[PDB]
Amino acid sequence: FGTNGFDIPTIAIALLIVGVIIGLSGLILSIFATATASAISNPSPGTLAYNLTHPLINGMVSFFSFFPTLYVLLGVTGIVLIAAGIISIIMEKF
Amino acid sequence: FGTNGFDIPTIAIALLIVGVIIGLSGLILSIFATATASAISNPSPGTLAYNLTHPLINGMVSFFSFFPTLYVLLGVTGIVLIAAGIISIIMEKF
Amino acid sequence: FGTNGFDIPTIAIALLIVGVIIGLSGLILSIFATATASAISNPSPGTLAYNLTHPLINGMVSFFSFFPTLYVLLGVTGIVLIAAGIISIIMEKF
Amino acid sequence: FGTNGFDIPTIAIALLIVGVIIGLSGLILSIFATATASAISNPSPGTLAYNLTHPLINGMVSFFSFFPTLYVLLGVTGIVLIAAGIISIIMEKF
Amino acid sequence: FGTNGFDIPTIAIALLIVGVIIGLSGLILSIFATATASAISNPSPGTLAYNLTHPLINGMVSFFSFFPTLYVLLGVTGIVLIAAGIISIIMEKF
Amino acid sequence: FGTNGFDIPTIAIALLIVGVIIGLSGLILSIFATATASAISNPSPGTLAYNLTHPLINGMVSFFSFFPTLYVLLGVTGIVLIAAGIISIIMEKF
Amino acid sequence: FGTNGFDIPTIAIALLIVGVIIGLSGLILSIFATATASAISNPSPGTLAYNLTHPLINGMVSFFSFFPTLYVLLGVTGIVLIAAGIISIIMEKF
């Protein structure tokens, strides 16, 4: 069901795959992050361990704050793909 | 029953396939998402685990909000295909 | 699901890998730094051991303060990659 | 249905294509701009980040304000094309 | 849909591409500039580091102030292109 | 989207590249200059080390004061380039 | 009763096997865990044996809390398998 490489069943299968992978990833990352939160303690505000450890958790927080826009762009890509398929169909179907 | 590549039985079979695949995908994704909801807990509003985990679920929500328009475009594609078939029939059938 | 080398499932898998590795790294570094903090003592402000040891901990603090911006740039790289993929799709999909 | 290169079905197909492409473009640009608005924050009116970032958003606003007249001219072009077709028909049809 | 090289679909696609690229660029530059603002500190008004660092941030501010007019001219170019297309159509369409 | 070598997407990409490189350069130079300021001390106003070291820091200050106008000219170059592109379009587009 | 490797009797037999194995496993693990609960005592809240033994039972509890989602995913796999069989039948049965 297509013209050259655009197959609606293939598109649906790809959507299935990407959705399941993203759900998987969220699950694994949340489960791991719970363990990370459990492991690290809060020594004190101002002794050596604090100076040694604070920037690491700051970097953790920053990167995990960067995740959402990555996911949003990944979502946007699919609309572009389906749309390019539509236009390619229209171009030479008539 | 057609002229070159437009076969109404083939079209009906393709519609069967895509519909069943989409129903399958919805079923699997919902069942998996129920497990995801069960697994992740709500630690607290403001401690480390919250900072570590909140953006992930935000990205989850965003992508799953992107799904509907993808499905709508996928549906729109079929009308274009059937219509191109109709026009191609009319062009050289007379 | 792509054109030449841009595969959304591959992108999601790569995001999974990088996120898990970064969480791992933070965990290991924090656990090791706790041991470092425990091991080294504070001899006195002005005798020989202080002169011998202070610059080392200063360098420790400095490098660990350098970590955050490294992580931020590492996060920024992914947006560039996904975006280049989007543009490459658009260029020859039409 | 024409004389040399003016084909009313071809004209209708071209109108279909351009309309769908323009709707596509508006959709994609709006969805992307929502993400852009979400990503960038407002640091403060007068510190370093403001000086560093304000002209960029000013240029964004300016270019997007330039879009409308581009679209209007693009629309005007079609009337000229159809009209040239009409005149070319009249010239040698009699 | 054109005469020699002026194709309205191609024009719309080009507008899509340029708009998306400009939005991308603004996003990346703002995100990077936030990190730049975070990294550099304010040592003091009059010691060595100030003399060493102030002209650099001055040059930063100047160039980023130069960006807007560049964007405005880039926007102006498209009106010229579409208009040249219109005139070229009119010249030999009749 | 152009005539011979003037491509608006290429221009936007070039602007992206130059802006990011300039931000990079400012970041690296400021971070290095902070270390330079930390390393060198102030011996005394009138003994040997002062005579030995003062002209070096004077040359440092002078060159870094020369940077801003270099950046301003570098910014000016882009307006000239875009403008030459506009004029070249106008010359033979009609 | 199938096409290539999808055999409904084989599927039913596999379901029988997996169900019986899972029931077996639950039985054995519960019977063993009862003995584990009987064997270990509660020395006191704060003497040496408590420090020596508490983390072990904590790890026990954690892993056994991890079991349920493992079982849920194992259950989900079968729906995917049966569904892939259905789609494979439909693809080339017509």
Side-chain angles (χ1 to χ4, degrees), chain E residues 17-90:
Chain E
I17 298 167
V18 293
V20 82
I21 291 174
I22 296 169
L24 270 120
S25 45
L27 175 64
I28 296 169
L29 267 297
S30 53
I31 290 173
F32 199 111
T34 302
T36 71
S38 49
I40 293 93
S41 70
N42 297 114
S44 159
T47 103
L48 193 55
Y50 179 69
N51 291 333
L52 270 285
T53 59
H54 198 68
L56 300 164
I57 81 170
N58 282 334
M60 300 328 285
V61 165
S62 48
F63 199 98
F64 291 148
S65 335
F66 283 106
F67 270 100
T69 176
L70 297 158
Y71 276 163
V72 173
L73 271 295
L74 193 61
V76 174
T77 311
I79 298 164
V80 175
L81 279 168
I82 295 173
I86 288 176
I87 286 168
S88 45
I89 278 177
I90 292 171

Side-chain angles (χ1 to χ4, degrees), chain F:
Chain F
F1 200 47
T3 178
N4 49 3
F6 197 58
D7 181 73
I8 296 91
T10 309
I11 301 300
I13 295 166
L15 263 68
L16 199 150
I17 298 167
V18 293
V20 82
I21 291 174
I22 296 169
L24 270 120
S25 45
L27 175 64
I28 296 169
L29 267 297
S30 53
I31 290 173
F32 199 111
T34 302
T36 71
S38 49
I40 293 93
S41 70
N42 297 114
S44 159
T47 103
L48 193 55
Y50 179 69
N51 291 333
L52 270 285
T53 59
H54 198 68
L56 300 164
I57 81 170
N58 282 334
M60 300 328 285
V61 165
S62 48
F63 199 98
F64 291 148
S65 335
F66 283 106
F67 270 100
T69 176
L70 297 158
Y71 276 163
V72 173
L73 271 295
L74 193 61
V76 174
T77 311
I79 298 164
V80 175
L81 279 168
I82 295 173
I86 288 176
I87 286 168
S88 45
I89 278 177
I90 292 171
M91 214 77 92
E92 68 272 12
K93 268 321 182 202
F94 313 95

Side-chain angles (χ1 to χ4, degrees), chain C:
Chain C
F1 200 47
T3 178
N4 49 3
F6 197 58
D7 181 72
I8 296 91
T10 309
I11 301 300
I13 295 166
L15 263 68
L16 199 150
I17 298 167
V18 293
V20 82
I21 291 174
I22 296 169
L24 270 120
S25 45
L27 175 64
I28 296 169
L29 267 297
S30 53
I31 290 173
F32 199 111
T34 302
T36 71
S38 49
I40 293 93
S41 70
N42 297 114
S44 159
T47 103
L48 193 55
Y50 179 69
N51 291 333
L52 270 285
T53 59
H54 198 68
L56 300 164
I57 81 170
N58 282 334
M60 300 328 285
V61 165
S62 48
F63 199 98
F64 291 148
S65 335
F66 283 106
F67 270 100
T69 176
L70 297 158
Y71 276 163
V72 173
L73 271 295
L74 193 61
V76 174
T77 311
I79 298 164
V80 175
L81 279 168
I82 295 173
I86 288 176
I87 286 168
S88 45
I89 278 177
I90 292 171
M91 214 77 92
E92 68 272 12
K93 268 321 182 202
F94 313 95

Side-chain angles (χ1 to χ4, degrees), chain B residues 13 16-17 21 24 28 31-32, chain G residues 73 76 79 83 87 90 94:
Chain B
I13 295 166
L16 199 150
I17 298 167
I21 291 174
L24 270 120
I28 296 169
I31 290 173
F32 199 111
Chain G
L73 271 295
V76 174
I79 298 164
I87 286 168
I90 292 171
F94 313 95

